[PDB]
Design a protein around this ligand. Structure first.
Ligand SMILES: O=C(O)CNC(=O)C(=O)O
Ligand code: NI
Ligand SMILES: [Zn+2]
Length: 456
């Protein structure tokens, strides 16, 4: 009972078995320079970034091309805008980029050491600068005659008022890259997911690392280097993710939630092409659906990032795949795909036939499952009350297992809590003291589905 149909897959064709010569093991990073501002709005640009064959794309001097004022994201500006704003700090050890060692520099290791704490934007800026001076002094002293670093991460720029001029600047981007867009699935969630449909600011010093990961539910990522400093990026095509996952298992680090920094020789040995590139100030990085990446600052710089859900067959498929996989692994999907799929079918025209078929198949599965559930409740003499969804009402998750609960809600009173059926039953043998709710009647879903047609 997958929400996906295998025959519908648009995933590109790659063979692990076929041998790869060294050069194929280091691919050139897809790179774009915009001659004219109107280029950034070319449908050619969109088709290039979202292409399945392009796991990652750098847009060179994007900020210049559109006259983005990155100064608005400079550390001084941020201190002025929000000094006491809190920031999540990661205490790491500074190392070369293509290397992560044990304590003695005997051996390369996958597990990545990162330690959490919290400070204020103001205090972190003081460190970032003090950090800079000291490196400068040591540089001058020489001319005249384990380094521990702190990394400022996941700083939340969600509030509009404080960050108004900052966020307004990003409206200059093409629609498919914007925080909020009718063509962006994350805009159809109906609630705010920090760091995905809101902006995240990173404040870095040389050696600052973000370890290996895929984005939540395989959503695309957009990243802009404020500068001055150059960031170094590593990426691997979605196709090889499970192989990288097996490495984490064998080294006893959780792939999804663990902190790991790949051993490059391991990948090459495994016939896995790695993308290596530098991202300079004003360069924009587009991370395509489900690309495995990890990043290091080489200089002193800030970055901004957020996620975007492109309305493409490939993004949709990969989003749904990771949605099902999370459930298998008992990991909460932060993007409620079923609720999102219905929102999209209902507020957005779909012209692409491969995408349309996928959303359609998903909706159908959702109806069948709701229909199977309604009868089993009915011939158990369980009563289902009709509740009607409130305007701007957020999806629901089971208080126990974290699974998305759609259409039919099981509710209890401690006030109120929502569960899936398994967790409600587990709690009560007969569902006694459990109120079952119906968000929409078979008819609502049946009519929305039939009205959902391919657009020219
Ligand atoms: O820039 C960083 O440190 C981490 N950023 C990302 O992984 C991203 O933009 O998807
Ligand atoms: Ni990322
Ligand atoms: Zn549950």
């Amino acid at each position: 009972e997958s929400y996906l149909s295998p025959a519908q897959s648009v995933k590109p064709k790659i063979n692990t078995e076929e041998k790869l010569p060294r050069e194929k093991l280091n691919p050139p990073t897809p790179s774009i320079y915009l001659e004219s501002k109107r280029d950034a709005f070319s449908p050619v640009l969109l088709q290039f970034c979202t292409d399945p064959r392009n796991p990652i794309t750098v847009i060179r001097g994007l900020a210049g091309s559109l006259r983005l004022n990155l100064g608005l994201f400079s550390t001084k500006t941020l201190v002025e805008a929000s000094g006491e704003h809190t920031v999540e700090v990661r205490t790491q050890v500074q190392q070369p980029s293509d290397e992560n060692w044990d304590l003695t520099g005997t051996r390369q290791i996958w597990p990545c050491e990162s330690s959490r704490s919290h400070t204020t934007i103001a205090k972190y800026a003081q460190y970032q600068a003090s950090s800079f001076q000291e490196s400068l002094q040591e540089e001058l002293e020489v001319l005249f005659q384990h380094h521990i670093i702190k990394f400022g991460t996941n700083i939340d720029l969600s509030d509009a008022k404080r960050w108004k001029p900052q966020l307004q600047e990003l409206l200059k981007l093409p629609a498919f890259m914007r925080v909020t867009s009718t063509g962006n699935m994350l805009s159809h969630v109906g609630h705010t997911i920090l760091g995905m449909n809101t902006v995240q600011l990173y404040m870095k010093v040389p050696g600052s690392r973000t370890p290996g990961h895929q984005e939540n539910n395989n959503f695309c990522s957009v990243n802009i280097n404020i500068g001055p400093g150059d960031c170094e990026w590593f990426a691997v095509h979605e196709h090889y993710w499970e192989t990288i996952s097996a490495f984490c298992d064998r080294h006893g680090v959780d792939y999804l939630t663990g902190s790991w920094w790949p051993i490059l020789d391991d990948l090459y040995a495994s016939n896995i092409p790695v993308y290596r590139f530098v991202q300079r100030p004003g360069d924009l990085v587009w991370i395509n659906a489900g690309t495995v990446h990890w990043v290091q600052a080489t200089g002193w710089c800030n970055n901004i990032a957020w996620n975007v859900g492109p309305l493409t067959a490939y993004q949709y498929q990969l989003a749904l795949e990771r949605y099902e996989w999370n459930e298998v692994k008992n990991v909460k999907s932060i993007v409620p795909m079923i609720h999102v799929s219905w929102n999209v079918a209902r507020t957005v025209k779909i012209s692409d036939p491969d995408l349309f078929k996928m959303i359609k198949f998903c909706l159908l599965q959702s109806m069948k499952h709701c229909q199977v559930q309604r009868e089993s409740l009915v011939r158990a003499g369980k009563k289902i009350a009709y509740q009607g969804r409130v305007k701007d009402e957020p999806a629901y998750y089971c208080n126990e297992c974290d699974v998305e609960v759609f259409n039919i809600l099981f509710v209890t009173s401690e006030t109120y809590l929502v569960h899936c059926e398994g967790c409600a039953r587990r709690r009560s043998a007969g569902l006694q003291g459990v109120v079952v709710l119906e968000q929409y009647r078979t008819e609502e879903l049946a009519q929305a589905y039939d009205a959902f047609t391919l657009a020219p």
